Design a protein around this motif. Structure first.
Motif, PDB file in Angstrom:
ATOM      1  N   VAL B   7      70.437-110.920 -34.706  1.00  8.02           N
ATOM      2  CA  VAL B   7      70.059-109.495 -35.268  1.00  8.02           C
ATOM      3  C   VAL B   7      68.871-109.894 -35.636  1.00  8.02           C
ATOM      4  CG1 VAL B   7      71.409-109.686 -36.887  1.00  8.02           C
ATOM      5  CG2 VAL B   7      70.133-107.117 -36.583  1.00  8.02           C
ATOM      6  N   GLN B   8      67.893-108.404 -34.857  1.00  7.73           N
ATOM      7  CA  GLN B   8      66.063-109.100 -35.299  1.00  7.73           C
ATOM      8  C   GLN B   8      65.885-107.761 -36.637  1.00  7.73           C
ATOM      9  OE1 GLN B   8      63.980-110.563 -32.609  1.00  7.73           O
ATOM     10  NE2 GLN B   8      61.922-110.108 -33.073  1.00  7.73           N
ATOM     11  N   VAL B   9      65.342-108.275 -37.741  1.00  7.34           N
ATOM     12  CA  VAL B   9      64.498-107.002 -38.261  1.00  7.34           C
ATOM     13  C   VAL B   9      63.145-107.334 -38.563  1.00  7.34           C
ATOM     14  CG1 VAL B   9      66.415-106.194 -39.989  1.00  7.34           C
ATOM     15  CG2 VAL B   9      65.039-108.260 -40.540  1.00  7.34           C
ATOM     16  N   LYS B  10      62.398-105.696 -38.750  1.00  9.05           N
ATOM     17  CA  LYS B  10      60.864-106.217 -38.810  1.00  9.05           C
ATOM     18  C   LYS B  10      60.463-105.866 -40.628  1.00  9.05           C
ATOM     19  CE  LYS B  10      58.841-103.429 -35.347  1.00  9.05           C
ATOM     20  NZ  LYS B  10      58.999-102.587 -34.203  1.00  9.05           N
ATOM     21  N   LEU B  11      59.550-106.002 -41.057  1.00  5.22           N
ATOM     22  CA  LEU B  11      59.250-105.612 -42.343  1.00  5.22           C
ATOM     23  C   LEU B  11      57.797-106.019 -42.619  1.00  5.22           C
ATOM     24  CD1 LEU B  11      61.330-107.725 -45.244  1.00  5.22           C
ATOM     25  CD2 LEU B  11      61.518-105.876 -44.253  1.00  5.22           C
ATOM     26  N   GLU B  12      56.904-104.738 -43.310  1.00  2.00           N
ATOM     27  CA  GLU B  12      55.316-105.172 -43.614  1.00  2.00           C
ATOM     28  C   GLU B  12      55.113-105.040 -44.752  1.00  2.00           C
ATOM     29  OE1 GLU B  12      54.230-101.549 -39.673  1.00  2.00           O
ATOM     30  OE2 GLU B  12      54.519-101.535 -41.371  1.00  2.00           O
ATOM     31  N   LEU B  13      54.252-106.173 -45.071  1.00  2.00           N
ATOM     32  CA  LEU B  13      53.346-106.905 -46.052  1.00  2.00           C
ATOM     33  C   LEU B  13      52.343-106.310 -45.903  1.00  2.00           C
ATOM     34  CD1 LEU B  13      56.721-107.693 -46.190  1.00  2.00           C
ATOM     35  CD2 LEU B  13      54.909-110.060 -46.520  1.00  2.00           C
ATOM     36  N   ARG B  37      57.741-102.695 -46.940  1.00  2.00           N
ATOM     37  CA  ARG B  37      58.233-101.317 -46.486  1.00  2.00           C
ATOM     38  C   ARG B  37      58.619-102.159 -45.242  1.00  2.00           C
ATOM     39  NH1 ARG B  37      52.594 -98.530 -45.930  1.00  2.00           N
ATOM     40  NH2 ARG B  37      51.895-100.034 -43.771  1.00  2.00           N
ATOM     41  N   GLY B  38      59.375-101.413 -44.808  1.00  2.00           N
ATOM     42  CA  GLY B  38      59.888-101.626 -42.809  1.00  2.00           C
ATOM     43  C   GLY B  38      58.861-100.426 -42.157  1.00  2.00           C
ATOM     44  N   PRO B  39      59.037-100.370 -41.164  1.00  2.00           N
ATOM     45  CA  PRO B  39      58.468 -99.598 -40.165  1.00  2.00           C
ATOM     46  C   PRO B  39      58.709 -97.991 -39.786  1.00  2.00           C
ATOM     47  CG  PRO B  39      59.578-101.122 -38.956  1.00  2.00           C
ATOM     48  CD  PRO B  39      60.044-101.066 -40.253  1.00  2.00           C
ATOM     49  N   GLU B  40      58.227 -97.171 -39.995  1.00  2.00           N
ATOM     50  CA  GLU B  40      58.475 -96.163 -39.636  1.00  2.00           C
ATOM     51  C   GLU B  40      59.457 -95.609 -40.284  1.00  2.00           C
ATOM     52  OE1 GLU B  40      60.911 -97.236 -36.007  1.00  2.00           O
ATOM     53  OE2 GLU B  40      59.604 -98.459 -35.166  1.00  2.00           O
ATOM     54  N   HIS B  41      59.148 -95.195 -41.556  1.00  2.00           N
ATOM     55  CA  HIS B  41      59.873 -95.484 -43.059  1.00  2.00           C
ATOM     56  C   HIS B  41      61.182 -95.518 -42.310  1.00  2.00           C
ATOM     57  CE1 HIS B  41      56.171 -92.777 -43.209  1.00  2.00           C
ATOM     58  NE2 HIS B  41      56.225 -93.080 -44.696  1.00  2.00           N
ATOM     59  N   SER B  42      61.281 -96.628 -41.918  1.00  2.00           N
ATOM     60  CA  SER B  42      62.866 -97.233 -41.947  1.00  2.00           C
ATOM     61  C   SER B  42      63.359 -97.485 -43.182  1.00  2.00           C
ATOM     62  CB  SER B  42      62.639 -99.056 -41.066  1.00  2.00           C
ATOM     63  OG  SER B  42      62.144 -99.322 -41.383  1.00  2.00           O
ATOM     64  N   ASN B  43      65.120 -97.374 -43.527  1.00  2.00           N
ATOM     65  CA  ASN B  43      65.619 -97.880 -44.358  1.00  2.00           C
ATOM     66  C   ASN B  43      65.613 -98.735 -44.762  1.00  2.00           C
ATOM     67  OD1 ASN B  43      64.338 -94.922 -44.790  1.00  2.00           O
ATOM     68  ND2 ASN B  43      67.150 -94.224 -45.161  1.00  2.00           N
ATOM     69  N   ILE B  44      65.713-100.085 -45.311  1.00  2.00           N
ATOM     70  CA  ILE B  44      66.096-101.368 -45.225  1.00  2.00           C
ATOM     71  C   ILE B  44      66.523-101.633 -46.318  1.00  2.00           C
ATOM     72  CG2 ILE B  44      63.454-102.018 -44.250  1.00  2.00           C
ATOM     73  CD1 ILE B  44      62.448-102.585 -46.745  1.00  2.00           C
ATOM     74  N   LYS B  67      64.339-103.147 -57.351  1.00  2.00           N
ATOM     75  CA  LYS B  67      66.137-102.625 -57.228  1.00  2.00           C
ATOM     76  C   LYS B  67      66.254-101.670 -55.718  1.00  2.00           C
ATOM     77  CE  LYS B  67      68.393-105.267 -60.491  1.00  2.00           C
ATOM     78  NZ  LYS B  67      68.881-105.333 -61.926  1.00  2.00           N
ATOM     79  N   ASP B  68      64.850-100.718 -56.416  1.00  2.00           N
ATOM     80  CA  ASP B  68      65.144 -99.636 -54.989  1.00  2.00           C
ATOM     81  C   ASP B  68      64.076 -99.067 -54.598  1.00  2.00           C
ATOM     82  OD1 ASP B  68      67.895 -98.611 -55.926  1.00  2.00           O
ATOM     83  OD2 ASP B  68      67.351 -98.832 -57.594  1.00  2.00           O
ATOM     84  N   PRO B  69      64.054 -99.042 -53.425  1.00  2.00           N
ATOM     85  CA  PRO B  69      61.861 -98.422 -52.587  1.00  2.00           C
ATOM     86  C   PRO B  69      61.516 -97.364 -53.448  1.00  2.00           C
ATOM     87  CG  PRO B  69      64.302 -97.753 -50.682  1.00  2.00           C
ATOM     88  CD  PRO B  69      64.641 -98.382 -52.704  1.00  2.00           C
ATOM     89  N   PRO B  70      60.399 -97.440 -53.859  1.00  2.80           N
ATOM     90  CA  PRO B  70      59.389 -97.850 -53.148  1.00  2.80           C
ATOM     91  C   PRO B  70      59.383 -99.482 -53.143  1.00  2.80           C
ATOM     92  CG  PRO B  70      58.575 -96.369 -54.510  1.00  2.80           C
ATOM     93  CD  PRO B  70      59.606 -95.930 -54.316  1.00  2.80           C
ATOM     94  N   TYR B  71      59.525-100.583 -52.768  1.00  8.61           N
ATOM     95  CA  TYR B  71      58.998-101.937 -53.256  1.00  8.61           C
ATOM     96  C   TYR B  71      57.250-102.314 -53.581  1.00  8.61           C
ATOM     97  CZ  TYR B  71      63.920-102.012 -51.646  1.00  8.61           C
ATOM     98  OH  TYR B  71      65.334-102.035 -51.075  1.00  8.61           O
TER      99      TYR B  71
END
Lengths: 8, 138
Positions: B7-13, B37-44, B67-71
């Motif tokens: 499984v591959q997940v993408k993150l945006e720093l 964050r994650g892309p497309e407002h994904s729920n990471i 502990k909870d978004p926004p990070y």
């Protein structure tokens, strides 16, 4: 440089 | 077993930094904000336990824990530094976290404000069934 000074 | 899985997940720093119109009373010349964050407002948040920003020790309460978004972290400062970021997973088995050394850089007055984005892909080979379900709910 375009950047400010830095800290470590 | 006959099946394997990856499984591959993408993150945006990323970070934003602006020269202040008037420095703070401390002398701080810039306002900045850094984020994961994650892309497309994904729920990471489905697979991310917490995000920890390790600020430079010059800052008060340098270990900032989300502990909870926004990070994200919003501060004022006067100098760029390396900011280690740790993303903790809702997992029981390795890997339980991933670390990135983020370059929190600031630009001089007279140059445009900073708006920087850094994409990172995480690859989990054969996660457990429950980690796998959270990963794919994101």
């Amino acid at each position: 440089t375009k950047q400010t000074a830095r800290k470590s | 077993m006959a099946s394997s899985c990856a499984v591959q997940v993408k993150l945006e720093l990323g970070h934003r930094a602006q020269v202040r119109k008037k420095p703070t009373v401390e002398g701080f010349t810039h306002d900045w904000m850094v984020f994961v964050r994650g892309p497309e407002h994904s729920n990471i948040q489905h697979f991310v336990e917490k995000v920890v920003f390790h600020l430079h020790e010059s800052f008060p309460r340098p270990k900032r824990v989300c502990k909870d978004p926004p990070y994200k972290v919003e501060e004022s400062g006067y100098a760029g530094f390396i900011l280690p970021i740790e993303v903790y997973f809702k997992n029981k088995e390795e890997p339980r976290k991933v670390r990135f050394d983020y370059d929190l850089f600031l630009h001089l007055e007279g140059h445009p404000p900073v708006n920087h984005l850094r994409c990172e892909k995480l690859t989990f080979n054969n996660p457990t069934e429950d980690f796998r379900r959270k990963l794919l709910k994101a």
